[PDB]
Design a protein around this ligand. Sequence first.
Ligand SMILES: *CC(=O)N(CCC(N)=O)NC(=O)[C@H](CC1CCCCC1)NC(=O)[C@@H](NC(=O)OCc1ccccc1)[C@@H](C)OC(C)(C)C
Ligand SMILES: *CC(=O)N(CCC(N)=O)NC(=O)[C@H](CC1CCCCC1)NC(=O)[C@@H](NC(=O)OCc1ccccc1)[C@@H](C)OC(C)(C)C
Lengths: 301, 301
Amino acid sequence: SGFRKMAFPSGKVEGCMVQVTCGTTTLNGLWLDDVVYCPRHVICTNPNYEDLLIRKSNHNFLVQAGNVQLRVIGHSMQNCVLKLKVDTANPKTPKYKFVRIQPGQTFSVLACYNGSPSGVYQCAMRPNFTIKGSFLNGSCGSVGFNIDYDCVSFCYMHHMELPTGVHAGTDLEGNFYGPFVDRQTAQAAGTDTTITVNVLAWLYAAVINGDRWFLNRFTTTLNDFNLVAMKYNYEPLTQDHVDILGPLSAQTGIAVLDMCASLKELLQNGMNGRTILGSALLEDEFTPFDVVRQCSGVTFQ
Amino acid sequence: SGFRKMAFPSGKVEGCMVQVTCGTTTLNGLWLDDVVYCPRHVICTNPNYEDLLIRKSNHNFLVQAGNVQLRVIGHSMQNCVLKLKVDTANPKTPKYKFVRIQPGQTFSVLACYNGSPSGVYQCAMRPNFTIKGSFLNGSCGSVGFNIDYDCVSFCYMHHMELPTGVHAGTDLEGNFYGPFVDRQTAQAAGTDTTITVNVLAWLYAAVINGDRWFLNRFTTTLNDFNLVAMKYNYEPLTQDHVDILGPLSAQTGIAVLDMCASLKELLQNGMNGRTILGSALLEDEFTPFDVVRQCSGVTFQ
Ligand SMILES: *CC(=O)N(CCC(N)=O)NC(=O)[C@H](CC1CCCCC1)NC(=O)[C@@H](NC(=O)OCc1ccccc1)[C@@H](C)OC(C)(C)C
Ligand SMILES: *CC(=O)N(CCC(N)=O)NC(=O)[C@H](CC1CCCCC1)NC(=O)[C@@H](NC(=O)OCc1ccccc1)[C@@H](C)OC(C)(C)C
């Protein structure tokens, strides 16, 4: 038992982080096979990156992998990422995919500085397409990922911090999550919302681990639930959400809609000085898949 | 900015986990050089382990490292851990030490099943020498660690879960943290307390990241602070604790004792529906070192 914000083991990704330097900018890159992926704003000097990149040669890119120089033999821009072809394939390349995740989906972040991993933590893509990360200067190029058996699905590369202290970035093909652009012009996160299906998953986690105090005898319709959720800035729950909570419903014996009735009363009454899974807030950064993986024992390799 | 419960990168440890099987018990072991460390209760059938172990031969121990059989060529018991000498040194052995940590100190846990890492999370050794882990059947042998530059300091190996859902285990030399013994006889955690110096560190984290609402104009003596802390089941703060909070004090300009005055008023008044670093509870599983590492950029390799 117990329930923790749990990241995937990070070794498969650690073996891919490298330092990319060019001009006076140094950031992190991701070395898979003979390609190094990094944020395009590594490019020298409202920038027009196509124009800035045609002025570069391969030898203006310094790629450090450990104590080993990698030689750049080709480059191209794909959306907001640079792809640097190097003359050596990464022998530690795991099996991998690039995936663009939906809001509400979680992933592990390996924070990196100068190509050296610093820590790993678990995150969610917020409904407003920011992530509440932990990032300092030089963390650009750090990636977020999930692991399925032996395969690393990369889903995030870090680019920028916004004025509110939250973070914005791209999928590994360089497309920003959300409306953000990689310029130093005023931008701000839209209004965020709480990820309802995830809160419900976490309440099921609480029950699996022995916490029941918040349950009730009431029930609710999907429509009536959504009416109360909107009022508390929760995302509407949809039937596919209900279907995804199916397995957790059947393992606990608590119908999804009955669990919606306790969330409703938790929203209306607060938590009255009690805690759930060591939290005094309703947690929304565990997906239904996260709960099942941690409460059943699924491994990866 | 941002502040997350952040584990060390786990790759150095992942390369050391193995499966140890003997009789009908399978658990995790830790392969460093030509020795595999695992919990001694892997031994077959109020057990007397010295008596049970003299009845075993090397070939009763099956050690799986990936798809590769390791051959046991010697064994011995050290406290509550078995040390199995194998005929092959682990080529992925990092630089490492074994360290017995104090209560209040944090570490990363790589949860493992059948020698396969499942997740990594951050923990603290509670004042009552349990850890609030996340562990299922078959996680025994999973280890906890810290990393300093390139060196893995192993500090925990997991053995058992107690009735309250918290966890007990040993240092890597087999000595239990706390009064626990590796028998299936009724045992229970002592009364825990909140780790005061860590709460103060986290409040400094909040200030470094821009949260100030909880500060106040008041101050307090060490003695007067401890009087209020005892009443709220907080550990007494000592002068060495004050000294350790020195650097965080000097970076923020908030004297330790003034930060004690805001903790005092936070304890006496509650948090009034506000949050600190996304928490509605006072967090105590970040050490002063954790805060500095995450809020300044210290890497490892
Ligand atoms: C490379 C890096 O480490 N990193 C992540 C920083 C972090 N703490 O997560 N990225 C950056 O520092 C960004 C570099 C620029 C380079 C030119 C192309 C765009 C990216 N910069 C930022 O992340 C800044 N954010 C920002 O400029 O947002 C747009 C904006 C501009 C002006 C007003 C409002 C919003 C950060 C570093 O700047 C602030 C002041 C927001 C912290
Ligand atoms: C091997 C393993 O995975 N693991 C960790 C379990 C977990 N969820 O963290 N360890 C064990 O399962 C322990 C194996 C025994 C083998 C004989 C030597 C001692 C260890 N068992 C436990 O952890 C049990 N705890 C326990 O027996 O505590 C002492 C006790 C006995 C009777 C009453 C109260 C206390 C767990 C699995 O049992 C309970 C019922 C506490 C969950």
